[PDB]
Design a protein around this ligand. Structure first.
Ligand SMILES: CC(=O)Nc1ccc(Oc2ccccc2-c2nc3ccncc3s2)cc1
Ligand SMILES: CC(=O)Nc1ccc(Oc2ccccc2-c2nc3ccncc3s2)cc1
Ligand SMILES: CC(=O)Nc1ccc(Oc2ccccc2-c2nc3ccncc3s2)cc1
Ligand SMILES: CC(=O)Nc1ccc(Oc2ccccc2-c2nc3ccncc3s2)cc1
Ligand SMILES: CC(=O)Nc1ccc(Oc2ccccc2-c2nc3ccncc3s2)cc1
Ligand SMILES: [Zn+2]
Ligand SMILES: [Zn+2]
Ligand SMILES: [Zn+2]
Ligand SMILES: [Zn+2]
Ligand SMILES: [Zn+2]
Lengths: 363, 363, 363, 363, 363
């Protein structure tokens, strides 16, 4: 009887950085149809479909006949988890960001390509908006990446502080998507905290999203455990010593907890937790930024401002090829040519001027 | 020894969107009897029975002899879950609603057909009642579907507010059945909340049914955690960032939480949770609507007002073929001809007039 | 069909003291590429890669074709756990430290070698800083190792007491890395404590890191259960009787709980818990040590002061070959020659003088 | 393919009373090396190594090639648990103590033998110290063994009451090691108590170590649930009726809970819990006993006073061969000859005199 | 390869009413030794050993070579549980007591036989003591058995009320051993109660041992939840309706909860819980009964008063052969002849007279 290559399914999971057994089962099954009569092949909607369709077609047909599909996908997903463990100990944090970048560029190459649906001019309007959020933004993003890559103890966490609709969440999300990693909710009590901090295992960075303090009901701020919990998580935030992180059906992982961001409202920060942050960026709602967005509907509809591709487009536009690792230089040059065709320094400056007047960014 | 095609059982589960292992085992076993001497074949009661009976008959006989029935059905149900994961990432939300629509029309074609038991005139009396519940109802339902399909962050949740027996529950249920998805109970404390929000995994939409607030015992309103919890679930309701949803024996899923509805009584909405809703629809008990229903017993007995087929019948009656995706145009035309035979604009208007006088809708 | 040697995978896990199934899967898979065309082979970055690449290459290719990779690695990791159990009962605590030392020297030989990236002069600047932290430091570290190796009941725990940024954490971490073992958090309540103390199973030593007391909010010290819990854990700290330690999916282990350190701020120690510690070392922030470090950035960036290799480099520099077990004498002599080439007693004394003036240690 | 004898691995586990799967895996693997070139064979350090090395050598080599090591050891450990169940119902409590004695004598024969490291004169100095702790000590130990062996309901528990460093813990530990069994912590609340009392399953005796009462903070005594819990555990302490004891992944065992000791500080004992103890021994710190020990460092360093071998050495020295079961008479005579060579009634009396003056026991 | 008869191991478990997998493994393994050279065969200590040794000897040797012993014993123990389920629904409660009786008589035949160790005259002294505890005792025990066998709703529970050392526990234990069944602890809160009441599954009777009430600290009575809980367990105690009982890894069993006894101190019984008991027996400490026992040491030492064999010996002595089911008449006659040889109505009456004077029962 015909036998499926577990090695080939693993290769596909490795190529797509697949961490989901059900999505792998689903993705691998869609390869069983003939590429000459396939709808998703000729339409070129997924890169993980037409490029791999030929390589996995025969194996996918065999797979469609397996009595043991879930096990095949479990070992593939486990090999992907096994790759990340080796990487976290033998890969330099620079090579870790190049990987993330190459991943974001594949998704970029797809959607802006002659078989994609996204509009590049709209993403560049996102870059305009983002570049208006803070002064020296392209340098603020570059200083963040240096900080996260270098991972220097006690100089690893940035604090984003401000009211709702100030840009703190959007930028933290954008950077989280830029570097790769997870967002964490430390508002739960110390008891259930342990399984939450375990989500941090093998992550390149974390965002402690919307951390809450107490005695701020008078400022219309809700109470939560987040601020006090963060004072107790000194070892995690400082990253001088390794910590024992827990998650279900697994021996508790030991590692230096990841660096990243903490976001919160205008709560008073305890003296001890304040010294844990190397930098603090204060965000305030600017009327021109909100009206601009209200006029540039596509930015919300397409989730452009929360996109890591948007911050990558920003770096490609503002920074020369030398500011990127040698491993993606040819990919940077290609994106630089493409962006040049769509926008210029004069038109970009006009987009920023349109943000400043709170008018639709694109005329 | 004779071997069962796991691939054929999976095909049947895929055809029927089967998420239940026990119902799949049961359904597949009933196919083992001869279609020439079968009772359920000639009676034509289930579409998932006579249309598939021929295709699965021999395999069902083999299946009846298997020592491993539950495993066969586990992989079939897993492949269905795997399809939804791929769909949630590679299918447009428009194609997701066309699927739901095609599903509802199969159930419609069955029950109103020459082997069904439901009375079409009674469903059209349901449409009358529903079309009386709010002005421009056919447009209110159409604006909801646009909102849910487009899934624009911060403009994704509608609030249905009113006392008991006002129509808010009925309509939320009707729309929930129209789009497909799950209802959620956030009245439990933050601790047990996490497994509840996980029910939202791969769902096209959610309904936070009967959300309770505090300090309303004086208005004869019971206390619950629902309102405060919803303020803390800002990330979920806004859908700008992806969230980590949990459920049993599964790695915590990351996705933009689904859009939908929140239903509640006349509790004061905190300023912060009020801005999370794009639209708020106020429902008030109308005496003519309750008496009408008291006179039109069939509507409760057959659960017509909570039916998504009822809202689909409404759209088919009020909207031209062009307001529907091209993929169901032939199916719309057929239903339009069928409805024409049973009702007219003059008789429909009379049904609405009968609702307005609180008389039985059908004379 | 080709069969993988489970015995060879176990041998590799045993060689590398591997306790992680996912890292073992990952490490063993990277051996499948040709050593003549391999990138990690010629670069000589991991010792667990090029030295074992030849021995495990063919088996790794077979392993890449296995339908049962996780099970193979489970038995390998279990055999490593089984080795530690036999060792904890049949190995002298002196042989246990020689093993830890040989492990640290392999990592040392790697990073300072002609294919490593670490700078030896920078580690020796770490030794300078550490040797300034307390008087007779080389003797304080040697008295700690005697204490931990001899494991005399009631004379097994040292207390490191002082404010934040005093050196207590750094040194406890450094010694914990020197001896091998785990850090424990006893700040959680007595209920969840049991699974925490189980982390101590087969450990050569433990560090109860940052133990908190009550009624110290007035000294800007946060409350925690740690101090009271430690009074109740008399049996564990005294080590006269064996204790029943618990962890998931395992029969509760019975053994004399490990010795080690307790770190805490300037909380009042209850009379009963004070007598449990043979020695108490008071740490105070010295301005010259902090400025020195602020000037010697490499120490934080490379985590030199928390390194057990740093304390081993210290012992190799200060102590003659006779102060080490006979089993590592040839390894001590080699490191002594290497250190001599880079630094002298005159230049070391200058480094200490630079610490004392709070200037960058290396000129 | 070569097949491992599961029966031979079980025989080894049975011989060594092995209750640990990981230690069995480890122990059985060390037998695979050639006994003619083995280091642990010629050194004669473990009796479970050289005596069994020949018998298990070939099977251990086969075992080293097994793909199913953990299962083999699970059945071996289960057979050992199965032996204890049969023994607890078909073995007389006298035969149960002879087994414990034979076990202690094997460990004794090993360490004092021409390939052991322990010094017999030092253990006899331990006997001196212990024989000074209470008058008629050799008779106090003998009355305890009668009490535990006979297991007469309501006359089964002895209470050891006194301050810290009084000898109560040491003696309870010594007797617990003499009889075999487990120590229990009943200071946890009634909720978590059930899994703690389950540790008592098949145990020959138990020690409720350091039981705490309330309203004693004024005497510098910490509060705990232990005293009240013990009043509620009337059925367990009385042993007239069988009790349902619980532990993980097992059907709740029914048996007469084991007899033993309760240790506690100078807390007031409730009238009802006082009648549950047949005997109460009051321990007070004697300055001469503490100074003696401070002068006889070897006693702590080697854990001689907590050793059951120490109490066995005591009985062998004080009691004639007739006071022991006929099954160990030849073993008693041999130890009597050996002890005679090292010590005399005159020199023993001098050791006791040295304890009484608080001087080092050995001159 | 030689195959073990799972059917034969099941037959042995069925014969011995074995509910323990570990004891079955142990018992079945001891049959592998030659019966001609076996020690336990010729000594005739266990009936489950020499009578079955011949029948299971060859299978036990095969079993000693099995790689799957625990599974074999799991199916045997499951078949025993399966027998009890069929019995509980198809066996009359009279046949259920005959089974219990035949079981007790096998243990009786063994211990009093020419290869047993128990003294019959001592058990008859137990009968004397028990027959003194309450007037018309032989009739009080017979009325209890009628009550439990007939199992008439609302007339199923007897209340044993009195202080400690009054006889209530002893008699409840004696009757519990007479009928077969389990003792339950309802002093835990309603939350953990559900798994406790599940112990009642397939049980012929239950004893709610030492039920505690509140507001009795003034009478030197400890507080517990037991009394209030019992008011809430109306359905269980009344046995008119079936109840859903829960236990681990099993679908919640539905049945009429078993009848039995409730024991408690002199707490006030709430009016509602008082009507749930058909009979209430008041026990008071009698000085003559305690002194008698103090003089008849063998009764405690051998646990004669808590023995169901003791109550069976009582019925055999007091009641004619006709008061027993026809199925055990030959067994009753044999015991009647045996008892006649050891004791007479005149000597029994003297034993009762010795109890009444508080003197040792046997002269
Ligand atoms: C109907 C409705 O809810 N409308 C709505 C539309 C846009 C809104 O803004 C945002 C939404 C998402 C992400 C970022 C922002 C902003 N960032 C900044 C940054 C700085 N100064 C202002 C803003 S707003 C808020 C609400
Ligand atoms: C005996 C009994 O319980 N009778 C009963 C019968 C009908 C009732 O109404 C409803 C029941 C289900 C769904 C919707 C409604 C209503 N929707 C509106 C909408 C607007 N103004 C009024 C209503 S009623 C209530 C109670
Ligand atoms: C921006 C920022 O956070 N800077 C920073 C830089 C260095 C700091 O110090 C330390 C950091 C890690 C480990 C040890 C120390 C010290 N040990 C002693 C020991 C004795 N007297 C002083 C010290 S400091 C603190 C903070
Ligand atoms: C530095 C340090 O902690 N020293 C130390 C050294 C010895 C100590 O004693 C003991 C230690 C273990 C076991 C027993 C004892 C005693 N038993 C009795 C029995 C009767 N009267 C006195 C004692 S002491 C206490 C402390
Ligand atoms: C040293 C010690 O603890 N001695 C001891 C010895 C015997 C004791 O009694 C009993 C023990 C077990 C079972 C029953 C009884 C009694 N039943 C009745 C029944 C009626 N009036 C009196 C009694 S006593 C109590 C304590
Ligand atoms: Zn394709
Ligand atoms: Zn049919
Ligand atoms: Zn290599
Ligand atoms: Zn050997
Ligand atoms: Zn026998």
């Amino acid at each position: 009887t015909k036998q499926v290559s577990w090695k080939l399914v693993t290769q596909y999971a490795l190529d797509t950085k697949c961490e989901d057994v059900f999505l792998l089962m689903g993705m691998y099954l869609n390869f069983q149809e003939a590429p000459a009569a396939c709808a998703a092949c000729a339409a070129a909607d997924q890169p993980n479909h037409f490029n791999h369709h030929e390589k996995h077609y025969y194996n996918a047909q065999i797979f469609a006949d397996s009595k043991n599909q879930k096990s095949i996908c479990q070992q593939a997903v486990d090999t992907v988890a096994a790759k990340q463990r080796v990487d976290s100990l033998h890969m330099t944090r620079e090579e870790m960001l190049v990987e993330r970048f190459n991943f974001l560029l594949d998704k970029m190459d797809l959607i802006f390509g002659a078989h994609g649906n996204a509009v590049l001019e709209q993403y560049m309007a996102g870059v305009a908006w983002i570049h208006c959020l803070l002064p020296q933004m392209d340098t603020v993003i570059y200083e963040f990446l240096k900080c996260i890559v270098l991972n220097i103890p006690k100089k690893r966490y940035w604090l984003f502080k401000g009211p709702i609709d100030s840009g703190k969440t959007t930028l933290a999300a954008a950077l989280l998507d830029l570097c790769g990693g997870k967002s964490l909710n430390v508002n739960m009590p110390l008891e259930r905290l342990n399984f939450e901090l375990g989500v941090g295992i093998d992550q390149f960075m974390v965002v402690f999203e919307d951390v809450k303090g107490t005695g701020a009901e008078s400022r219309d701020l809700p109470s939560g455990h987040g601020i006090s919990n963060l004072d107790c998580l000194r070892d995690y935030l400082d990253g001088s010593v390794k910590v024992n992180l827990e998650r279900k059906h697994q021996n508790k992982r030991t590692q230096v907890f990841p660096p990243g961001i903490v976001t919160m409202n205008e709560y008073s920060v305890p003296r001890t937790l304040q010294a844990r942050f190397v930098r603090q960026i204060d965000f305030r709602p600017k009327a021109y930024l909100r009206k601009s967005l209200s006029c540039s509907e596509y930015l919300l509809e397409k989730r452009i401002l929360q996109s890591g591709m948007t911050l990558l487009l920003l770096l490609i536009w503002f920074r020369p090829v030398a500011d990127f690792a040698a491993a993606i230089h040819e990919r940077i040059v290609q994106w630089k040519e493409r962006l040049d065709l769509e926008i210029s320094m004069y038109t970009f400056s006009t987009m920023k001027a349109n943000v400043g007047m709170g008018a639709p960014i694109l005329d």
